[model samples]
Target: CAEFSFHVPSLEELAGVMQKGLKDNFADVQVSVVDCPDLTKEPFTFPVKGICGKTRIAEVGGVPYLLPLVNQKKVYDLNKIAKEIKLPGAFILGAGAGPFQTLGFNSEFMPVIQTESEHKPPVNGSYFAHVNPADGGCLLEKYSEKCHDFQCALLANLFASEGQPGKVIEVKAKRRTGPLNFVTCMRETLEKHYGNKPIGMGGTFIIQKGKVKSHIMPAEFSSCPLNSDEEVNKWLHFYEMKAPLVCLPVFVSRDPGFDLRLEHTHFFSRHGEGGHYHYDTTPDIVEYLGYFLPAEFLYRIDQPKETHSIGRD
Candidate 1:
């Protein structure tokens, strides 16, 4: 199949195209279209719970302090909705490290690191500094904070309305870092702490210095299934999708397993200019979705760039 950078369509345009494409392509399959809650907007009021690791620190004079461990588990409560909704499958789309930098150290400030492997201590030197339950203070200490915020809000809203029952299928792009060590760490942590939810690594992105350079290559969809691999693989195959990378860890079966693989290609041929210019065409929607949809379907839809202008007249 011919590969192209994912398109960024407005929310309305995306919904419209997805609805049309799915309806037209999969006439036998059931598909429902509804408005997901916009958590980024005003009224950030929502019930949320954070999950993390815990460690104890001995103090000089006072009692030993118990701190929420960092660089470990970073998850929001989604069981409330899990009890309510009934669906064949559920999927969670997470941002990769391009225009969205959700899973790294704070961009503005670096935390104090005790060792090369130790989680960076928050600037406040508090146990829960990195964990933000309410809207206050800087929550960027960890790369997954923004992800937690958005995903939690989304889950909360979904549970409140539809109430689906199933494990969330986390879909995110693979990080630029070679070997994708962090991706393995995150997948393991999520499975261990959050009842073994399945995860899918979409396409890969390129980052030079501190800027996202280009959408280097297409990503395959892989999953660690809570149910059976046969079922999960069947669903993916139904869409004509390829299996996940063989290098990373899997929840079960390991016949095709291999060491963590990294992409070495590093030239931004798509854009003529430097890495900064690459963001100009960066798609607003998660790039991984391209892997599932037909190229012709995406091409037929009118993207936001085609209709909107940035200047004020």
Candidate 2:
């Protein structure tokens, strides 16, 4: 009688409690929604209904377990657009010639421009950034910087491939704050060295674990198929304007096995079709997704006028 008594539940008791709790609380949630044009309409509401409904796992004790709400796809809106953009920005890691291909050309190619070296940089020659409004108007502000000019020139050279087949033979990065700022530094450094010239620069590298493995020249040049530190360093020089110590990254991968390379390796050759290698060409919208998606399905959305459910006894 003097000894203390324990109130702890036994293994069987605990199991029973858990089993009863699970049986007492079980909820399944489901969400679904029909695609709509005007999201504000009653049929198409915000936060979308239908598609995202969650199924409850099981609850313990007397508590209820509610499934998470599924976010259904509705009409396109500003929020939807912003979310989509941000999502891609996270997974897609591209530098050297995107976000500001201009800087990639002018700033990175300063040494090549200054040296007037015949040594080709990596890739199809250089980078480019153009501005062509879809409203049948031109945007001058898009080409204000010299880097922009460099990109335009590079793009001009690749007229045969329509700039689509162009390859990235080399790529370099230093984990900067943003693409714009990074390109700005690139342009500034190049301007300091190469005074004036529509220089060419291009290169390629591999991306692994969210980082670019050292840059490499394309396989076209005898020095290509960059598989060593020296080669990567040499390519870095072109964009970094490192002078004799570092040369630009300019080489194309022509080997058939090099699937990552451009199919028409000589598309930018001096004698290619639609050859305007040195002429000032106009810019287009540069539709990244449009080129990949089918023209008919790109912006097409189904708009059903009416629907009804029939039941038979």
Candidate 3:
């Protein structure tokens, strides 16, 4: 079994340790430390923009902190500080402005940064929408009727040639129905193609024959109501029918709106109780790092097995 953990350290502290470690361990390599404001702190805006209505578009706000212009002063100051300590060739990695501070604002409005004319809607003219399943999957058609803008026309033309009887093929390979009616279509398509087998939704689509029945679970249990014993047991009973329950510890979010939040903790115990094997950790770690670090260096600290678990318990 493999486990991973994190060592949270201040920027200054981490830089200091890295500097010392490099200087002492590898004397041949050059070492430099960059000092800048915490881009993760507050008041930062995403550099990209989206278009709204025909005339309205999102405004280009402040320069991102990572830009040379935004951090030139701080970079020079840090360089000067390094020179004072007899480090002449030191380079600084400037920080960017905080993007999280404006999350609530952005989430509420979902501003469009691009020009109105430049905005591209989905190729099928079907933007993702939440609709009641009770509508018998006709809501998608109703929703599409309300939108008649240039973007919609463009998307409709793009996918018109490859349209099926009840579906529109946007791109080659991956097929998608109207967003609001996706679940309805999905259920119908699965039943038609695969018969009434037990299906489970977690990480990948799972189908089982015999006593198992169809069930839908988020890719991550942490996103579901897995915290309570009652909720976990309920799922356990559901999966029992689909015997030999398979569980994978994957990304889970409790936020129904899927809002942007700083911290996330998902549960894996229930999955284990349900008789799922712990698959490879690399994919999970890679997915987690995509939001924070580069994919190449995620396994940089792989050695020296430590007991401290970083994410969800």
Candidate 4:
């Protein structure tokens, strides 16, 4: 009944969306066409087709399931992720929910960009691991209903074992509103183009001078299914921070039927300002540089039933 099978939009669509969201919401916003990268020469490939751990954190029915972030699904196992990419030259680099949200365990959990003495309460996570590894670097603890030998997961981009190539689009934003951050606007632009279709994308951001509202789940071991907001708050403490930080965001948009984090962005910096991505209270003039790419077949490993929970509670 329809025409063609798949037709990906050009990069201009993104440029248009940024104009509306940035200019309308902020005082002074600027956008320009970033000169395209070398497709053949660059090591990193674009429009990454094969993505793993597509199922980020989700709330099934009422309980917030950590999904693949807290633990590795069959597809996300270390060896499989590194050795078994469907594409030959493509490398994996994506932003997703961190492990601290599920449960805070020891050993694996390292304090980076920790909820400082300045934090008031309801702290959001705001710091994480860098692409380059480090000791006790922004590692997040996982869950097993209490203790499944919680292996710490990195809150940074999940790079493949073959060493991800260094070539990503540079997106910068200044005077950005908390709710209308760059990523949110990107999703809105995407939804406008695709409508009700199941869209898929991934991004990894590095902050030269970070200013984000994020959180790092404090160390604690509790049961699976963070059942109530009380327990949820205990683990998912939302911290607002604005420093050099990093985060693999979990800001999946609202589709027709999808149970994923709406705008759960975590930030981590070199100076220990990291945690779950929450409300970004960046400075009056905040700036960023990041990468976002779409996938051919976004494989959702553990999608939930009913989800419409915008995490800021």
Q: What clash count does candidate 1 reach?
A: 7
lDDT of 1 at 226: 19
Number of the candidate with higher TM-score, 1 or 3:
1
Candidate 3 residues 147-183, lDDT tens each? 3321210000000000101111110011111231111
The TM-score leader among the candidates is 4
Order the candidates by TM-score, highest first.
Answer: 4, 1, 2, 3
lDDT score for residue 293 of model 2: 6
RMSD of 1: 23.5
Look at candidate 2 and tell me the lDDT of residue 61. 9
**Between 3 and 4, whose TM-score is larger?**
4
lDDT of 1: 0.19
Model 1 alpha-carbon drift over 4 Å, by segment = 1-76, 95-289, 293-313
lDDT tens per residue, model 4, 1-313: 0011122344465556555665655555544445434322322222332223222222212113342123332112222222233322223333343344334332222211111122211112222222113432344322233433212243222222112333323456666654666567666756665665544445455554535655444444345655555655655544456555444443434434433344434444445445555445654666665554443333232343433343233
For each candidate in turn, the TM-score is 0.17, 0.16, 0.15, 0.58
Q: State, as a TM-score between 0 and 1, how close model 2 is to the true structure.
A: 0.16
* Model 1 lDDT per residue over 1-313, tens place: 1112222223343334333333332222122223323222222111111101111110010000001111112222222222222211112111211211233321111111111112222111100012122532223223233343221210011101111122112222322222222223333333333232222222112221122222211112123321333433332211111111111111111111111111111112112211111221122211221111101110011111111111100
Instruction: Give the whole-model CA lDDT for all candidates, comma-separated.
Output: 0.19, 0.18, 0.19, 0.39
RMSD of each: 23.5, 29.4, 23.7, 11.1
